[PDB]
Design a protein around this ligand. Structure first.
Ligand SMILES: [Ca+2]
Ligand SMILES: [Ca+2]
Ligand SMILES: [Mn+2]
Ligand SMILES: [Mn+2]
Lengths: 237, 226, 237, 226
């Protein structure tokens, strides 16, 4: 729904809406046109790991991807997230395919968020961690094509019985409870997220990618957000 | 009906023969008649602390109550909770007032749950927002101007509950160990010294709600006294 | 050193000192003669996982072992650990081999301990987590034959360059910092531990096992504690 | 020499031209001359809170100071700490007094460190034991009858430090992300309003000790003012 901060792992270069001429990681602030990007040395058929950080004192949103016994790529962006996001949010995972496709499979997801004030008597803390997923994950809001398979992996996008990915799917999984990330008299807010993903593709140059995103609590797949908009934005402004 | 597992602090008269003659802390499995209780030296106008824990290998559910510079009271019950509770639950607090001037104010509440074969949950609150969007408030429950969670009305016979918003995955076939731990602090404010009062941390089915009839000594948790 | 609580994973049945007639898990309280045991369905050449719990309110020391896609075994014992242990301890892992042998290899180790009183303003908390190990693990006290190998696995007992285990080794690894587990006005103390282990053996019936143990801070391999005494006790009382 | 990374609270006059004219919070990289500082509204006899964090992807080290019902001051410095600090370190607190009647009492201290490719450490103390065996106390540092950690003497020119006992693994070749976070609360008690005082959280080589000459404004951390 209308408000969106996101870390995007973007397999398919969509040049005319600002994407660099290669797979990339980027930080998206209220738009699909990453405020910052870094080359993403994608490795199809391998398990990748994403770490994401933010601290409201530092005011830096950071992300890393690496694969097992391989190099890593990092992207950063200076952003005060309380001038962007509501004080209460939902956190989620998003993925799409277009004409070109890919599995957008998630193996694990963890998230930690803290909110501190003056008195230690005034604060909150939230943590969740999933290694594989229930067949009816009742603490997840599954949106669009998102489903958990017979292996207990979370499939954000359509995959056939065969084990093979479909074109034109959107999926999203959001954690059930809203997260309190700012408040009038907050001194420090911070969050950390990790996920692991498996992207497989027959295709030359797969599509479209995965995000971790933070949104207003009532968020939903906006109509017309398929493909290159990754399930997040209604247009490409 | 709801499926209930509770740890309660109870200053009501329990006029049933089995049960005790003083304020007590007790462990409730599916019924208001505590499977196990212990003395509770209930101190009005002082902040109290409850720690509860369970481990599915140890199959021992236990709880402690203390006040600062005070001594504590503990209760345990050997129980296997994966044969009592559904796989997915919601956790919460509840309170009820008698016919006294008294508050049930929650200053803090934390919870951790672990499910190993694969699943972890943790929340922690010190005071509460005016709009606690991650709490499901039931009955007379509201967060006050001070950021304190008032489970009951600030005369008596109020019932109020507060659930954490996400369901908790506490068991599964593939499970080797499930554990949980919870802490809360509370303040009963009252001009009386031994008012009739009840306050609980509880676990239940995810679609749980207040049963009509459940006031006073059924703690907002149960319809019968069975 | 003199005071020892331990969860033992006992591969070799030593009948005449109380061992049951099979591999077992046991809780050892100040003696090698387990206060409680359960049949341990050992699976050589597989990664096993031990979880250990205690809570001073419940007064129950618990442990579980399982392997990957296999059944699990559990043992329990009602013990108030503050009548047994000092208020400050070191936590550790031990292993031995005798004439019969085995690798006693540790892949990960985590430990959490909490101590609460009246006021939340009076408490302590400690947590460590190792997945694989530095070649010079500076936060471990390595005792006897304990070493971290070229794979970053912790080998509590002697293994040849070949990859093959030697007989008559003792090893122990203790975490550097002492742990505060009780105090005059404690309301609740609790700890949790997890480790993963690989036991390989040519032998028919390997020896001798691995423990997780809690001891006085100045603990050390007592002389004459080899073999069946698992690196912990100086005799078999 | 020792290798020092510190966050400091400083009320000494700093008479060197570059440096500031009021009590300040600052980030020290290997020298007493803070790579980055900010105003510190230093409230004597009120409990203060410091939060510090770092992430090796963000390469931004930052800190906040606040008092209850008060507003806060923050400081950041872009730095890569795997080029400044050894791989293994010891973390600690330090304080120094001037020529004033003032305490440097630590009420609480927590620390978390993560090293990912594989390594986690966390400790948390609210008050301290009479015999804090997991702390290495240096110089005038002792735990008092109230369980509070006094870094300096209860006249001035005391220096005192307290290290956490285990070494911390903060970097390695194979490392993808290293992060840490620390919090402490403190109380400077003094009959004066703006006494000359210094209090730090710091990271150093594991064999670190108090350098001679390091009194007052060198915070117990550095031998020179270079
Ligand atoms: Ca794209
Ligand atoms: Ca044996
Ligand atoms: Mn893009
Ligand atoms: Mn045995």
């Amino acid at each position: 729904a209308d408000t969106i901060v996101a870390v995007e792992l973007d397999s398919y270069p969509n040049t005319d809406i600002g994407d660099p001429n290669y797979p990339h990681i980027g930080i998206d602030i209220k738009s699909i046109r990453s405020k910052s990007t870094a080359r993403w040395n994608m490795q199809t058929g391998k398990v990748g790991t994403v770490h994401i950080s933010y601290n409201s004192v530092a005011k830096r949103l950071s992300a890393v991807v690496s694969y097992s016994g391989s190099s890593s790529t990092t992207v950063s962006y200076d952003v005060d997230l309380n001038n962007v996001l509501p004080e209460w949010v939902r956190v989620g995972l998003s993925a799409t395919t277009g004409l070109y496709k890919e599995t957008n499979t998630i193996l694990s997801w963890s998230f930690t968020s803290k909110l501190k004030t003056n008195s230690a008597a005034d604060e909150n803390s939230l943590h969740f961690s999933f290694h594989k997923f229930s067949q009816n994950p009742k603490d997840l809001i599954l949106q669009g094509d998102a489903f958990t398979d017979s292996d207990g992996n979370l499939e954000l996008t359509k995959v056939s019985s065969s084990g093979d990915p479909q074109g034109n799917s959107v999926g999203r999984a959001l954690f059930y409870a809203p997260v309190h990330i700012w408040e009038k008299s907050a001194v420090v807010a911070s969050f950390d997220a990790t996920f692991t993903f498996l992207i497989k593709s027959p295709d030359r140059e797969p599509a479209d990618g995965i995000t971790f995103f933070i949104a207003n609590t009532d968020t939903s797949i906006p109509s017309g957000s398929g493909g290159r908009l990754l399930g997040l934005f209604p247009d490409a402004n």
